[PDB]
């Protein structure tokens, strides 16, 4: 069929716009996911020795573009960097809604009393470390970046599930394995690569 059967056979949670991300009750502030990850990005832009005035910070690409913001002799260094960042949430609770750039959140639904992550939520707050803004859903997020056949899938790419990837979406880490905030009462967790509902392409965000 069209759905990873193991998961709720649904569409992930679709949270709209530029989430408020950071808020500080004593200070009298807060910030939206994009202005924490064009934060992100100009600092890993300034780390690299490349960053400009023209510069956001905001580090996305056309979708369906080969190119990107960050020169591809330092994606294998930003790839490794969202993949440590996603990996360092190993053990968070899942929560159906949660998570945005800053890191997880109380969620939506069955998520609402549970500071934590969702798929795409995960997915999102690994990426923004390099300035990659990606929306709060897993269907939206699959029309971003570029495909690769699932077959050619590569460390650092990200799968999908369901009709328009609208169900699931992990990080894939390489043999075989892949980074998910699978489902309710789970963690963030490694687990290995689910071929049922995996879409036909995996999105590559970052080139090298």
Same mark, same amino acid.
């Given at each position: 069929?069209? !759905?990873?059967?193991?998961?709720?056979?649904?569409?992930?949670?679709?949270?709209?716009? /530029?989430?408020?991300?950071?808020?500080?009750? =004593?200070?009298?502030?807060?910030?939206? %996911?994009?202005?924490?990850?064009?934060?992100?990005?100009?600092?890993?832009? @300034?780390?690299?020795? &490349?960053?400009?005035?023209?510069?956001?910070? &905001?580090?996305?690409?056309?979708?369906?573009?080969?190119? #990107?913001?960050?020169?591809?002799?330092?994606?294998?260094?930003?790839? @490794?960097?969202?993949?440590?960042?996603?990996? %360092?949430? &190993?053990?968070?609770?899942?929560? !159906?809604?949660?998570?945005?750039?800053?890191?997880?959140?109380?969620?939506?639904? $069955? *998520?609402?009393?549970? =500071? #934590?992550?969702?798929?795409? #939520?995960?997915?999102?707050? $690994?990426?923004? *470390?390099?300035?990659?803004?990606?929306?709060?859903? %897993?269907? $939206?997020?699959?029309?971003?970046?570029?495909?690769?056949? $699932?077959?050619?899938?590569?460390?650092?790419?990200?799968?999908?599930?369901?009709?328009?990837? %609208?169900?699931?979406?992990?990080?894939?880490?390489?043999?075989?394995?892949?980074? @998910?905030?699978? /489902? =309710?009462?789970?963690?963030?967790? =490694?687990?290995?690569?689910?071929?049922?509902?995996?879409?036909?392409?995996?999105?590559?965000?970052? @080139?090298?």
């Amino acid at each position: 069929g069209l !759905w990873d059967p193991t998961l709720p056979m649904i569409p992930s949670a679709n949270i709209p716009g /530029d989430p408020i991300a950071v808020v500080n009750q =004593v200070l009298g502030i807060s910030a939206t %996911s994009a202005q924490v990850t064009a934060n992100m990005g100009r600092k890993f832009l @300034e780390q690299l020795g &490349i960053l400009q005035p023209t510069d956001t910070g &905001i580090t996305n690409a056309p979708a369906g573009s080969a190119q #990107g913001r960050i020169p591809r002799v330092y994606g294998r260094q930003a790839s @490794e960097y969202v993949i440590r960042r996603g990996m %360092s949430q &190993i053990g968070v609770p899942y929560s !159906w809604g949660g998570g945005n750039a800053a890191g997880p959140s109380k969620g939506i639904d $069955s *998520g609402a009393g549970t =500071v #934590g992550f969702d798929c795409s #939520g995960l997915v999102l707050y $690994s990426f923004a *470390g390099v300035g990659i803004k990606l929306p709060h859903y %897993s269907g $939206s997020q699959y029309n971003l970046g570029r495909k690769i056949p $699932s077959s050619q899938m590569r460390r650092g790419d990200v799968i999908f599930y369901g009709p328009n990837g %609208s169900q699931h979406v992990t990080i894939y880490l390489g043999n075989g394995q892949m980074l @998910e905030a699978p /489902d =309710v009462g789970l963690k963030v967790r =490694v687990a290995p690569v689910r071929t049922a509902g995996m879409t036909p392409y995996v999105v590559r965000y970052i @080139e090298y």
